[PDB]
Amino acid sequence: TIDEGLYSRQLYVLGHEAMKQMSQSNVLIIGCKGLGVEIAKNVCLAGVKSVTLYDPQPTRIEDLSSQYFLTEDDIGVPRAKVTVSKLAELNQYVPVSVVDELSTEYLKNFKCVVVTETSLTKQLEINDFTHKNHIAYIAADSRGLFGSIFCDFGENFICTDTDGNEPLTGMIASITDDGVVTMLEETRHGLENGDFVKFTEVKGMPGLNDGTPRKVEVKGPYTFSIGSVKDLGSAGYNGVFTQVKVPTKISFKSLRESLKDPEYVYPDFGKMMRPPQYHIAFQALSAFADAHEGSLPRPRNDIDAAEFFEFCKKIASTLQFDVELDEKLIKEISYQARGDLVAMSAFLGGAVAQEVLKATTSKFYPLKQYFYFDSLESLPSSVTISEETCKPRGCRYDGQIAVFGSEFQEKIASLSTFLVGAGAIGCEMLKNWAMMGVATGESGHISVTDMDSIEKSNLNRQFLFRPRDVGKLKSECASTAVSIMNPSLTGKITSYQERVGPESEGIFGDEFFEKLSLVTNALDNVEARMYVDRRCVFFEKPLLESGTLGTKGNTQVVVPHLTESYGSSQDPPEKSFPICTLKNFPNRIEHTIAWARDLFEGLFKQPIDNVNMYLSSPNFLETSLKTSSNPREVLENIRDYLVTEKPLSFEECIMWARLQFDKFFNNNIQQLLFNFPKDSVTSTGQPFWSGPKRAPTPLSFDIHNREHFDFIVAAASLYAFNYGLKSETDPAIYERVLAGYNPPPFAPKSGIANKDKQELKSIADSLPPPSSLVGFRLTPAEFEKDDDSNHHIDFITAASNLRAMNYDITPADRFKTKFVAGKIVPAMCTSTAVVSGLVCLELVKLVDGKKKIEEYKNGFFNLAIGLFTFSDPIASPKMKVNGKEIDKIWDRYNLPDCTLQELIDYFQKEEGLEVTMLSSGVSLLYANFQPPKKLAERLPLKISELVEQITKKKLEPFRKHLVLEICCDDANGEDVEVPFICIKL
Amino acid sequence: MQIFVKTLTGKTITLEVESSDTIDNVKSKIQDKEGIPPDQQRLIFAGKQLEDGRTLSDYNIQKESTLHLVLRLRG
Amino acid sequence: ALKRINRELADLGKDPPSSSSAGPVGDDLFHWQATIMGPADSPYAGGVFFLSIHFPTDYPFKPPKVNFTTRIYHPNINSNGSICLDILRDQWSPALTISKVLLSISSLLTDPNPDDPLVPEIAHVYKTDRSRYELSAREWTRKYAIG
Numbered sequence A: 001t002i003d004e005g006l007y008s009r010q011l012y013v014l015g016h017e018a019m020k021q022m023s024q025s026n027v028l029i030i031g032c033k034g035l036g037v038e039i040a041k042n043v044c045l046a047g048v049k050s051v052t053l054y055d056p057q058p059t060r061i062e063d064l065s066s067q068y069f070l071t072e073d074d075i076g077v078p079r080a081k082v083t084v085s086k087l088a089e090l091n092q093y094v095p096v097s098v099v100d101e102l103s104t105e106y107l108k109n110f111k112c113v114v115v116t117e118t119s120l121t122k123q124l125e126i127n128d129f130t131h132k133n134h135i136a137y138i139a140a141d142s143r144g145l146f147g148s149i150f151c152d153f154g155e156n157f158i159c160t161d162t163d164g165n166e167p168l169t170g171m172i173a174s175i176t177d178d179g180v181v182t183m184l185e186e187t188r189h190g191l192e193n194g195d196f197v198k199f200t201e202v203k204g205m206p207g208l209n210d211g212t213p214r215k216v217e218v219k220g221p222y223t224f225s226i227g228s229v230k231d232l233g234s235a236g237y238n239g240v241f242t243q244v245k246v247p248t249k250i251s252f253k254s255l256r257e258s259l260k261d262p263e264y265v266y267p268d269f270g271k272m273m274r275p276p277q278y279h280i281a282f283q284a285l286s287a288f289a290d291a292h293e294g295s296l297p298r299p300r301n302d303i304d305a306a307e308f309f310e311f312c313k314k315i316a317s318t319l320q321f322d323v324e325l326d327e328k329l330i331k332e333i334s335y336q337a338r339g340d341l342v343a344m345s346a347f348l349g350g351a352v353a354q355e356v357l358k359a360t361t362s363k364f365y366p367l368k369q370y371f372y373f374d375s376l377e378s379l380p381s382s383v384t385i386s387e388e389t390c391k392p393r394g395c396r397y398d399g400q401i402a403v404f405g406s407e408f409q410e411k412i413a414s415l416s417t418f419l420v421g422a423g424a425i426g427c428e429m430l431k432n433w434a435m436m437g438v439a440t441g442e443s444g445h446i447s448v449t450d451m452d453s454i455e456k457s458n459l460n461r462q463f464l465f466r467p468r469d470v471g472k473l474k475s476e477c478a479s480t481a482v483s484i485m486n487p488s489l490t491g492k493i494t495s496y497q498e499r500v501g502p503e504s505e506g507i508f509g510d511e512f513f514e515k516l517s518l519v520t521n522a523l524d525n526v527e528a529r530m531y532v533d534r535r536c537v538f539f540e541k542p543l544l545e546s547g548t549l550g551t552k553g554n555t556q557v558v559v560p561h562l563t564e565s566y567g568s569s570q571d572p573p574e575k576s577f578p579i580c581t582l583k584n585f586p587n588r589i590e591h592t593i594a595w596a597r598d599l600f601e602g603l604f605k606q607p608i609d610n611v612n613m614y615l616s617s618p619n620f621l622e623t624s625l626k627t628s629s630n631p632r633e634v635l636e637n638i639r640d641y642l643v644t645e646k647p648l649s650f651e652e653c654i655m656w657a658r659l660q661f662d663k664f665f666n667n668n669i670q671q672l673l674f675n676f677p678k679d680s681v682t683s684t685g686q687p688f689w690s691g692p693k694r695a696p697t698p699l700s701f702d703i704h705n706r707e708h709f710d711f712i713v714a715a716a717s718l719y720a721f722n723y724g725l726k727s728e729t730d731p732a733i734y735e736r737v738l739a740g741y742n743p744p745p746f747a748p749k750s751g752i753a754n755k756d757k758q759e760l761k762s763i764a765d766s767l768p769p770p771s772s773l774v775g776f777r778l779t780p781a782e783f784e785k786d787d788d789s790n791h792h793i794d795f796i797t798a799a800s801n802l803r804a805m806n807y808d809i810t811p812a813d814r815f816k817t818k819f820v821a822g823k824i825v826p827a828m829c830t831s832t833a834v835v836s837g838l839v840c841l842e843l844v845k846l847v848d849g850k851k852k853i854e855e856y857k858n859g860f861f862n863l864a865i866g867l868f869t870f871s872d873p874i875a876s877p878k879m880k881v882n883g884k885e886i887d888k889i890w891d892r893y894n895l896p897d898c899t900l901q902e903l904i905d906y907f908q909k910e911e912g913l914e915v916t917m918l919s920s921g922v923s924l925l926y927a928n929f930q931p932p933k934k935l936a937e938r939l940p941l942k943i944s945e946l947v948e949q950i951t952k953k954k955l956e957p958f959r960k961h962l963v964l965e966i967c968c969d970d971a972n973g974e975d976v977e978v979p980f981i982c983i984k985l
Numbered sequence B: 001m002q003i004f005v006k007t008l009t010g011k012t013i014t015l016e017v018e019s020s021d022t023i024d025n026v027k028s029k030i031q032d033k034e035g036i037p038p039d040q041q042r043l044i045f046a047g048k049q050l051e052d053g054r055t056l057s058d059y060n061i062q063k064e065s066t067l068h069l070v071l072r073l074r075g
Numbered sequence C: 001a002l003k004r005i006n007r008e009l010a011d012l013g014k015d016p017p018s019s020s021s022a023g024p025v026g027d028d029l030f031h032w033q034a035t036i037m038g039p040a041d042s043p044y045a046g047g048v049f050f051l052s053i054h055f056p057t058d059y060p061f062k063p064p065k066v067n068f069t070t071r072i073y074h075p076n077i078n079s080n081g082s083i084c085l086d087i088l089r090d091q092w093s094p095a096l097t098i099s100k101v102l103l104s105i106s107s108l109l110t111d112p113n114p115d116d117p118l119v120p121e122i123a124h125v126y127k128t129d130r131s132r133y134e135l136s137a138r139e140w141t142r143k144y145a146i147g
């Protein structure tokens, strides 16, 4: 019942069972400030059964510092009543309600309870009931640059998946009678001792196919031991082993019990003495609020700080904590007590939403139990922060001014950022910038570029779009939405529709890039990341990279002249398969899926293109005869798709589909078996079809079978779409037409003047002339995974399953086929929120212009296990050039537009280096091994003229610089690396 | 001494070796008897894969030990 | 990338391979047109084969793409010229020069590997009727690899 057209990306992270159990749980959220609304948004996007809000406090202006669903026309109204209407629109399957008053017994109606902005007495009263009644209780708080999370899921929490990784699977070479199991060649099982596994498709030991779990004894990286298998058999040949995961019982402690004896989680191992401080500090904050009518300490107040420190001392004495309090850190928490930032709110909201999903679905390992986080390193130091500058000014930025001050507010309001891409991370970044007031001054500006369009599956994690917006451009909708969120950004946002690449340099030129302040990437492909990184390096602009994958996420910051570039942080490459394995000898479902995709392309895409080009290019045949690798293939395809096998109705499409079935699943396998019989042996006497090669078996077309019928339907539908006919789905027509079918006789063949040319000419003169068919064009089939009615994924699934049946491989359903064929990247809304929070926390460091490299942090996290880590950026490598210190990345040579000979003389004299190679992009301008005549012809030419002549392309009018890569040798002959040259045209 | 090497197809080859013999010598014997290049021989004993450059004694191989032979084939 | 390619090209220039001659196409450093001469003691004797080499961006951390252009009747080479060799797929390391790849391809021409073929019919003919395979190879290398 799960709408796979909307939760397509989320299911690959959670699963069908997880979401099915999640859609039957009720969540109550107490408190509806920035953190509360963020949690509610993430939960609603997640897909819980319902959400209930409870916050009777009337709205105030400062509450807009982080609440993005509030407007200045709502001042004086309870936040819940004005937020429910806007929240109910995020997802149509998640009702949202509001309760006027909250009685304790009412709490029995819910499955999870989230508590924010609530005093300690109320937290204790709620927890004393939600603990013994087995209701999940999550309490979150965000004070300035500090945050706290507490989780309590009862005393008998059952966790099914403990790490979020798929079960370990592997292919078995053979199993002895002693229980020794070995994988295939150079294959690591990766198992540990004590695990449970099950065996399937094991030959010689059918008993092991039942699936009963067995102990695992790891004897090495490639072998392990399972015990004694004497009774079931003596030796097992081939088969597949799959790991079995056992549930874990976790017993939590109530809040009242865990106040005295807390259990901490350390988000960073470089500072592990702080969380004991924060545990005292937050309780002191609650006590101080209770002692002054709920009024937090004033910002940067010394009297309130002293009273707060006295309260901290009192609490430490009362709770018998043998910890030496840190006066500086406690007073810092006191100063920022009334702070409310949007980056911290977004980060903690993402974390708490993930915790709610863990509590509801009984999946992943939750926090146990306290999680105290701080980003105090983000506090600016180049501006004046004091009690006078941090006082509220009666504006919507008070929640931020109370932490950063008015001078830093002015610095923020004059930023000119550039966001590349408008995906989920782009939407979150735009929300954060709108809330922070980025580029709201006279000199501020924002530019966002993205060339994609909104799809239905994107609405699950991109909250700035709506179902009515499907089909429109992302950048325009995002700009309009964020202008609605913050009216001050009206006319301060520019949205482009251009793909960032080499061809867009005419728009994102030097004039555009010299006015920016920072660039933030929200891309999803490595090529664009590398290109943007190179451009930023050339222009020396700070860069913010961020990536997500399911529940994992990472954020990196690049600072000019200080840290290394994104290039060197390149990830390991991807996986591709040899042509030999795909063509003839597959052994996994991925191989069959790739083969099915190639078959689809070669059946419904390439012949159509050839026919269309023949009917468009006047001289196509002659060029293809002497250019195409297989002109005979092209001519035969044209003939078949024009005259020989042109369908006239749907019955002929069914006949053609049956013929293709026989041609691809029955005749090729017979030919392959004829070439390599099942009893054949290698040159060494070893059997051929052994190990990584599986003996295929021809398929006989059984109409009653489901897979055959699916393949026939899919092929007929695609052929009709290619010829623009009308397809049908009733089985009656298929059964009727395929009943009277006579398979043409087929036998394997051993093989054994200008006849070939005369054959080609005979094919050619049979083709109808191009003039006879004018305006007749065939529609190619462009692959589209997201559409469920285009018969693409159905065809791929059918072909993959049939080929798996050929080679005795386990077939896969449509879910796995769609995941593999489309290269879908799993994604989550919580990961997006967390990465956006981290990036925006680094942005305030970038604005302040911190110089030391120890003040920046690259972040990594994995929410499936509650892991967070932060490490300093890597410094840019240095080098010695002519006895001088040179940065390898952030240095360049600036030279005028001089002749090549003058450039060589300058490098020989000024730098004392001999130029041996000079290139501009992918063109070799000059080399020391070229013949003297060519050099003498090229030496007296200017650089621009030389480039134009070599590249056979005139320089564009907007071009203003040339980046030259030069390899030069020293006087002794030792190669020395030098930075690139920036020729100024 | 004598040892037995079992292949993936259930065959048992008997070899006359010494505890001090190197793995290279055993792979050479297996190539001489079955014609499998040493580079493609993966010999396993007691859950540990024998590596070139060492001796049988290094792996605690004693009288009438049993090894398993598999073949690593490229694409 | 570019620096590594230039180093390899300069090394090739200094030492003439005699049996091989590789060079960039036009002035593009990421597209070479290599030449291989058929071995004397092989069915492809007296033949010139032209190969297209495309270097990846992360070269030499990634193997180059090598495709035949002259039609050849070989078990491990299909009609499209795709080559079935290990050093180009997994054994690739940031230490092998293009000269090593050309020498390896010449050796592959010297003796095919029918045990793990790419064109099953050619391998079957090779294993069953060697003389017919030799005749076919001579006919093809005379029709396509000459002129």
Ligand SMILES: Nc1ncnc2c1ncn2[C@@H]1O[C@H](COP(=O)(O)OP(=O)(O)OP(=O)(O)O)[C@@H](O)[C@H]1O
Pocket: A009, A420, A421, A422, A423, A424, A449, A450, A451, A452, A453, A458, A474, A498, A499, A500, A501, A522, A523, A524, A525, A528, A825
């Ligand atoms: N070279 C590029 N220049 C500009 N924008 C780009 C470039 N490459 C990708 N993008 C944008 O990056 C965003 C990718 O985000 P995301 O992957 O979440 O969305 P999607 O690709 O539409 O979805 P899915 O990955 O689920 O199919 C898209 O807006 C795409 O337009």
Ligand SMILES: [Mg+2]
Pocket: A452, A453, A455
């Ligand atoms: Mg898209």
Ligand SMILES: [Mg+2]
Pocket: A524, A825
């Ligand atoms: Mg994408």
